[PDB]
């Protein structure tokens, strides 16, 4: 039997199978406690639990696709949707440090230590995987993954104990203490292997193709319009007909989508109580851009997220500025004009999406509370689904010697750490590209850069990512 | 070309610390046995006498 490190995407006219492999490292915990919290806010505080476990977060898109493979994805296909996912934990080498006392560290190898692996197929434990935090994976396959520690927030009971105003969320009857050691635990010793084998639900595709037409300009530019438009107001209408030059008063049969607090340049847009509780709903809905290119510069929005760096790394949503969205887009009403910045849902509407890019998420989670709309596509990129890919928790073990009969001899957790290899494969159901009788060469697919500093390549940790994000809508539909 | 890296086994950590050398130190010895066959032709004829 052959032991392999697998990596690489294989394309077809149908789905592409993209696998990657990293080296993980379950470090250590000198205390295997649970370590509740002590936040004690003073102005609704938080209340958590710090589990001694390690989950892994392969959420982003820049791990399954190389930049050459992402460029081959954009210039050849016109949709993408995942349908399968397997996570194999390869060769495990749990080892122990012997503390040379004069050298400090000497690492032998342990055959009796193990690595407790739990897969949460039943969704019993809280899901913290898809929120966009700075522990995902290395972008390049040569660096070592350090998987994050598992922790979660619960709901408790806010008290007010202190001197001035000190609040503290204590435990209530609704609060929960999920001990992960009440489960089934593939114990997974040295050399052991384990798999997950998830299967994605039917999700709508992401349509990696722009438009060569405005949605409000879909008419014959000649010929006028069969209908009329008012001239006088005040009870005596006196409607007139239209010519072909009436472009700003052409009647549309479909409205644009909502623009709830789209502005340009804290908390952004925010719900909450009077002025100071005020939790943020930062990257808007998915129907809104937060960065595009107007006639002179880049407009950058209040509701933007930076994706790195600062100056920021924002995706250029040029396909939302086209179809009647954008940042400083007011709506006007002739009520006895009222400039409004919020646009409502407007029963017949189309708002296409905020575009996915090379570094976006893949799923988040739709929360278990009911009556969702629309929630098929989450913000921060990705899909977002009921029953997401389950979390793979990885503790090592507390091997706890020696004793000597009465004594607390030694360290009693001796010291152990585990290295390994995680090979994650995911298949994406690709759709065929939309037809164009176009005759023009379509624009080329290359990541954006400015001058001299090229995109993904080593320079004199070396490897540098571009200033703008590499979006995915660069071929035209033609609507 | 037959490329041969070893691996970057990268311990220990201790939970937060950058303990040790983190590439610990490793080296690999081995044996490469390379066989090659050469299609030989027969020697050209000479009625030479020398």
């Amino acid at each position: 039997v052959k032991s392999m490190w697998s990596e690489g995407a294989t394309f077809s006219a149908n789905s592409v199978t993209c696998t990657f492999s990293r080296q993980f490292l379950i470090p250590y915990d000198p205390e295997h406690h649970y370590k509740v919290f002590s936040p004690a806010a003073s102005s609704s505080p938080i209340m958590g639990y710090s589990t001694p476990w390690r989950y892994l977060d392969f959420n982003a898109l820049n791990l399954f696709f190389s930049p050459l493979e992402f460029q081959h994805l954009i210039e050849n296909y016109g949709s993408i949707a995942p349908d399968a996912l397997t996570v194999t934990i390869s060769e495990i080498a749990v080892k122990d440090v012997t503390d040379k006392t004069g050298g400090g560290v000497q690492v032998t190898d342990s055959t009796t230590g193990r690595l407790c692996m739990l897969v949460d197929h039943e969704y019993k434990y809280p899901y913290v995987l898809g929120q966009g935090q700075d522990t995902l994976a290395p972008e390049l396959p040569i660096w070592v993954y350090f998987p994050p520690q598992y922790a979660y927030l619960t709901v408790g009971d806010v008290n007010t104990q202190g001197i001035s105003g000190d609040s503290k969320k204590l435990a209530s009857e609704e609060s929960a203490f999920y001990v992960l050691e009440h489960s089934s635990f593939q114990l997974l010793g040295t050399g052991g292997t384990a798999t997950m084998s998830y299967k994605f639900p039917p999700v709508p595709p992401e349509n990696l193709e722009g438009c060569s037409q405005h949605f409000y300009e879909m008419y014959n530019p000649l010929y006028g319009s069969r209908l009329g438009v008012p001239d006088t107001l005040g009870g005596d209408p006196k409607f007139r007909s239209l010519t072909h030059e009436d472009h700003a008063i052409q009647p549309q049969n479909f409205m644009p989508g909502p623009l709830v607090n789209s502005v340009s340049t804290l908390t952004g847009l925010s719900t909450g109580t009077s002025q100071n509780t005020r939790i943020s709903l930062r990257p808007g809905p998915v129907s809104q851009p937060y960065h595009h290119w107007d006639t002179d510069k880049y407009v950058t929005g209040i509701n933007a997220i930076s994706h790195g760096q600062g100056v920021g790394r924002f995706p250029n949503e040029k396909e939302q500025l086209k179809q009647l969205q954008g940042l400083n887009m007011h709506t006007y009403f002739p009520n006895k004009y009222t400039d409004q910045i919020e646009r409502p849902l407007m029963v017949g509407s189309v708002w296409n999406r905020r575009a996915l890019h090379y570094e976006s998420q893949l799923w988040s989670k739709i929360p278990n509370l009911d009556d969702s709309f629309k929630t098929q596509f989450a913000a921060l990129g990705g899909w977002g689904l009921h029953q997401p890919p389950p979390q793979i928790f990885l503790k090592i073990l507390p091997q706890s010697g020696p004793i000597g009969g009465i004594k607390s001899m030694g360290i009693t957790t001796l010291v152990q750490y585990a290295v390994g290899i995680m090979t994650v494969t995911m298949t994406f159901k690709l759709g065929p590209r939309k037809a164009t009788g176009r005759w023009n060469p379509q624009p080329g697919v290359y990541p954006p850069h400015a001058a001299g500093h090229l995109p993904y390549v080593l320079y004199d940790h070396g490897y540098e990512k571009p200033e703008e994000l590499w979006t995915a809508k660069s071929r035209v539909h033609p609507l | 070309q037959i490329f041969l890296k070893i691996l970057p086994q990268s311990g220990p950590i201790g939970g937060i610390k950058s303990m040790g050398i983190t590439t610990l130190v490793q080296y690999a010895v081995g044996i490469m046995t390379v066989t090659m066959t050469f299609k030989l032709g027969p020697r050209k004829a000479t009625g030479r006498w020398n």
């Epitope: 000198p30 003073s42 700075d134 360290i411 | 939970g15 937060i16």
Partner: antibody, heavy 121, light 102 residues
Framework: QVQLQESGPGLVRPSQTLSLSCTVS??????????WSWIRQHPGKGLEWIGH????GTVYYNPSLRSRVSISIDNQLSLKVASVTAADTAVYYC??????????????????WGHGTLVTV | AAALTQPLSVSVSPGQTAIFTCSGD??????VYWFQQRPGQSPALLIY???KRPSGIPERFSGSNSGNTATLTISGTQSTDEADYYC????????FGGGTKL
Amino acid sequence: QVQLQESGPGLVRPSQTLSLSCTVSGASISSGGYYWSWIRQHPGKGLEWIGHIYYSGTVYYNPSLRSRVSISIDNQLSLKVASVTAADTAVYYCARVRVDSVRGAGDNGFDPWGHGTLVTV
Amino acid sequence: AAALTQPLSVSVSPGQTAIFTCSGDNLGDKYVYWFQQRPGQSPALLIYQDNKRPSGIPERFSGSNSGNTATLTISGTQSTDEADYYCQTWDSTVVFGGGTKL
């Protein structure tokens, strides 16, 4: 450069609210991740830590001085230690720590300190 | 740990070293920070993360953290290092040490 200047009221013995303040110069305090500590030092003895506060209201306290002191932020970094029947006057420093990444162990230490005020009790 | 141990004072001459002890339970898997407090002045961050020094601190200060102790070694002590040195860790709140009076 970032400097921290204190404010001392003087001396009040018969159990009044000891109020302090620490205006930060060089950089604003609601500009990112930095704790803002209050640290004591008894003359002839080691340092003592009261508590630190983030700009979004969350404040950690010392478990020994928990029900006496109160840290607050109105771009002022106040401290309202009451019940001064125990005559602790020592010294009151301000200090800033960069907020760590993993929340487990402290990745940074108190690099910018204050000048220190001498309260008497 | 939650209670750092540190002796009272040390005695040194110019031309040698003075190594202090900051004892503590499981201090090897922790960060220890050293603070230089000259008399009449606020402390300054001397050695952070058990080995590193900032730009304002000269290159004669170095420390270590192994096992249940963390030392601070001064290489070539001058006539201006007579200052209280405190070790400080983070046992989930903050833990300050006693101080070796030099």
